[PDB]
């Protein structure tokens, strides 16, 4: 779908920090689920 | 989220502009001229800002000529594919209802298949929907009326889960409804079960109907949505590029070159005297602001005067470009024009026949497959046999069979290598028979006249 794919010369420096720290890489400590929600908040109530 | 029923996929929205271009090329010339600002660039936009500029632009466009090769190409493709009638395999009297009125409108299945083939040839997309009412119906969905689809793998199986299409109708009421009533049908697949519901609007409101899971004649509901998106490439929801993009843009280029050529012909096409070496003294003295030019009248000129009839000569570079684009149009392989001057040798063309008929064969196979799937789903509604087929006329370049061809077909039938039905299909394909095979059978079992 991309008009031009990235070639060998187009080795743009991707990043300098490891950023694969989600779920299994972090044993589920930092999760990166996907769920759209409205507003500027999403609060839930549980019994104290 | 938030139940955005009127949503359209981004790729389809991107392809909508090209779909509109192809459809407008199919329309004719009035659609192109009514939308000429997006095809023919203005010779100078500084004038286009001014009102005399837009008047000049309208004069420029109105004198142009739309060659209209794309529409003739599509007509030729449909004539080649849909010669005689598609053959139906399996019991007929049980499926006669589907053949006669495919969607309850009285429109036969052959005509709906023809429309499907035309829409899959021009803009390369369409849809066949099977709905249960008692009787099942096969619908045709325009390529612009498919709005949303999804491809989620369940157990690693390519499945169409979501599918939303727009259904158009005029509500049966008493008052004259100048408005179009728009109906959105939502088809969903949950845990291998087919569900559907209908969205209807009124006064800006949106109504949602309860989920209904249609069931087969025996039951068991479904595991897949009864909807196929046929196209030029393959019967998948993924967008297939229209086969007529290059031909349509070639027509657009020829149209703009024709606009320029017509402007040149209107301006400089007429001969002009262009008197040189002339002084106004002579003009006012003897010419008197009028020249009589017929063979009955001779006009005098002073010393060192030379009349020079000047008009643009033919075979210009704009004409060469126009003819080049016409030749390119022919080259792209469209059955677009018949050139009486150019000649072609028989036998040599039989090698490129398979090359030219590539898109025709692809569309024929795709439409036949889609109609087979639709008929199988309709049989599931009615609990009839599944092993039935609907095959379009895959043999192209049709023409009358010569006596030698007929004799060969008959001799093949005398040997046990051609079925009697296959012989009849071939004979009808050659335009030598019109009665049904069973009809002629009953008519010929009786003793010969002698």
């Amino acid at each position: 779908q991309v008009f031009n794919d990235w070639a060998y010369k187009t080795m743009s420096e991707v990043l300098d920090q490891q950023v694969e720290l989600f779920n299994g890489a972090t044993r589920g400590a930092i999760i990166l689920r996907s769920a759209g929600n409205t507003g500027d908040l999403s609060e839930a109530a549980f019994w104290a | 989220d938030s139940n955005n029923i009127k949503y359209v996929r981004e790729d389809a929205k991107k392809m909508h502009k090209l779909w509109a271009h192809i459809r407008m090329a199919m329309e004719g010339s009035r659609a192109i001229k009514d939308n000429a600002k997006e095809f023919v660039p203005h010779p100078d936009n500084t004038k286009a800002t001014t009102p005399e500029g837009v008047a000049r632009y309208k004069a420029y466009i109105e004198r142009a000529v739309w060659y209209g090769a794309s529409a003739n190409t599509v007509d030729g493709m449909l004539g080649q594919i849909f010669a005689r009638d598609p053959v139906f395999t399996g019991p007929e009297d049980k499926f006669d209802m589907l053949i006669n009125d495919v969607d309850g409108s009285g429109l036969s299945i052959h005509q709906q298949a023809r429309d499907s083939a035309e829409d899959a040839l021009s803009l390369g997309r369409g849809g066949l929907f099977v709905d249960y009412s008692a009787r099942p119906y096969i619908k045709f969905i325009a390529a612009e009326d498919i709005l949303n689809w999804r491809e989620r793998w369940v157990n690693g199986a390519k499945r169409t889960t979501l599918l939303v299409f727009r259904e158009e109708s005029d509500a049966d009421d008493d008052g004259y409804q100048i408005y179009k009533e728009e109906v959105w049908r939502e088809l969903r697949l949950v845990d291998g079960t087919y569900w559907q519901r209908t969205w209807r609007e009124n006064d800006g409101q949106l109504y949602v109907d309860d989920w209904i899971s249609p069931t087969k004649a025996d039951g068991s509901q479904f595991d897949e949505i009864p909807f196929v998106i046929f196209g030029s490439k393959n019967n998948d929801p993924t967008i297939d590029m229209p086969p007529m993009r290059d031909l349509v843009e070639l027509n657009i280029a020829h149209f703009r070159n024709s606009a320029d050529y017509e402007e040149a012909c209107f301006i400089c096409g007429q001969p002009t005297l262009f008197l040189s070496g002339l002084t106004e003294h002579w003009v006012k003295n003897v010419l008197g602001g009028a020249v009589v030019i017929g063979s009955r009248d001779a006009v005098p000129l002073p010393v060192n005067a030379k009349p020079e009839l000047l008009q643009a000569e033919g075979n210009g570079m704009v004409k060469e470009a126009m003819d080049q684009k016409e030749r390119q149009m022919v080259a792209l392989g469209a059955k677009l024009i018949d050139s009486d001057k150019t000649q072609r040798t028989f036998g040599e063309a039989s090698m490129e026949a398979a090359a030219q008929n590539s898109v025709l064969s692809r569309v024929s196979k795709n439409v036949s497959d889609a109609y087979t799937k639709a008929l199988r789903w309709a049989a599931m509604f009615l609990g009839l046999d599944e092993k039935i087929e609907y095959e379009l006329n895959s043999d192209f370049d049709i023409n009358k069979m010569s006596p030698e061809e007929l004799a060969a077909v008959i001799s093949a039938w005398q040997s046990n290598a051609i079925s009697f039905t296959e012989m009849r299909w071939q004979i009808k394909k050659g335009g030598r028979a019109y009665l049904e095979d069973e009809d002629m059978r009953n008519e010929s079992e009786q003793d010969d006249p002698l």
Binding site: G36, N37, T38, G39, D40 | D1, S2, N4, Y7
Partner: protein, 53 residues
């Protein structure tokens, strides 16, 4: 429409009668141009709430 299309005539007399012309009338259909004020529809506001542009 010609007003004096039908006239009396006297077969016994012999007099000149004035000739008549053919006038035409021209109708008209004026073109009216309408529009729409620019309407801001930025996608950010429609994305902050779960909605689509």
């Amino acid at each position: 429409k010609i007003q004096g299309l039908v006239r009396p005539r006297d077969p016994y007399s012999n007099a000149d009668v004035a000739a008549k012309d053919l006038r035409q009338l021209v109708d008209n259909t004026i073109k009216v141009a309408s529009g729409t004020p620019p309407i801001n529809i930025p996608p950010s506001m429609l994305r902050w709430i779960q909605k689509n542009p």
